[PDB]
Subunit: 149 residues, 3 copies
């Protein structure tokens, strides 16, 4: 009977949706996602900023953005090496903004940074001791993505 | 036409279900699951026992339970820090039972434990060297869930 | 109704397929998959060659095979200990072949290897120098699976 088969199909699809959600929750938990907190993931690959943005966007995340000290430390831990943050002053020199919009608030700049060095630096990397340095968007640093809480 | 479309979609569905099962298999393997052994996993978050139970049930798992010295060792290495076990003596003082049911088979109490210290301690935690200490269920410890072999 | 519901379910199936693809991409990323590069994964379990092949087969992968020094180094780093490679001379003693078919191209044999020692050695393990040694297929070494670039 077509209708009974259609109803079973709806149930099969709803069951699959729920199982996929469960799979997504288990993976986030295994990646260290804390309850009600956003999480960070890296493949430890170094690449220019444009590639990190593309990669994270493709995974439905964004380049990691430290909004506070705890998150900064979490990102530093995940990365292990220098890594790009989702913060740049490409739109207007001197005004750092998050890739997702809004003016930069919390910061952890190394002493004497940002300094738009040489020909100019519009991207930001979390470096030694978790401090920040503005650097060329064309330089290759570790790709760290963040996913919603 | 319609009956054919429906049959073709039932086939796509079966294939998708098998593909998701694969994703689950590969994820567990990547997280260290050994052939024929229970899969133990943590996000390294410390919280009260009530929360651990809720979290593990939310992922369709259960709070980690060491049924023997080998599983106890496995849990010890996953947790790294003090972690709640799925065991309590909430029914009868001194009678430790698994949250999933039954009397405790294996145990690894630390010297002078269990002591039901102070106002009482009805939960259990695996601590240094993998030894056990009873503790208040309200205290916050690492959340470690288990999934079937 | 019938046809509308059937059309909706096709949309649901395609949406679910896209979501599962996303989940697989994100899991590959967390597993360390580098852009356009093949990747290796291990659960750190040690088992006989027969079991490694069966396990990787279940996961839709293959026993890790280094096609060059780069891949050889990657497998060495994932395994951490001796691990089996998808290379054997089981068919014809002395002529090592990939389990995936074809004659062994790249090789990194330790001096004096392969020597089919004692009772016989038909499988190959990448040792703690990246160098290779032929060994009994019955011996238990780390299972490292390889997935496509
Ligand atoms: Ca500029
Ligand atoms: Ca600038
Ligand atoms: Ca700078
Ligand atoms: Ca009590
Ligand atoms: Ca007690
Ligand atoms: Ca105690
Ligand atoms: Ca032989
Ligand atoms: Ca041989
Ligand atoms: Ca040998
Ligand atoms: Cl720049
Ligand atoms: Cl208690
Ligand atoms: Cl052999």
């Amino acid at each position: 009977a077509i209708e009974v088969k259609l109803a079973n199909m709806e149930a099969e699809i709803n069951t699959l949706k729920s199982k996929l959600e469960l799979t997504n929750k288990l993976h986030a938990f295994s990646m260290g996602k804390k309850s009600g907190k956003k999480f960070f993931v890296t493949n430890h690959e170094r690449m220019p900023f444009s590639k990190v943005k593309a990669l994270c966007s493709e995974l439905r995340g964004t380049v990691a953005i430290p909004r506070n000290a705890e998150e900064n430390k979490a990102i530093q831990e995940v990365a292990k090496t220098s890594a790009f943050l989702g913060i740049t002053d490409e739109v207007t020199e001197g005004q750092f903004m998050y890739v997702t919009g809004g003016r930069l608030t919390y910061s952890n700049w190394k002493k004497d940074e940002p300094n738009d060095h040489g020909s100019g630096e519009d991207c930001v990397t979390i470096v030694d001791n978790g401090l920040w340095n503005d650097i060329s968007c064309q330089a290759s640093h570790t790709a760290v993505c963040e996913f919603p809480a």
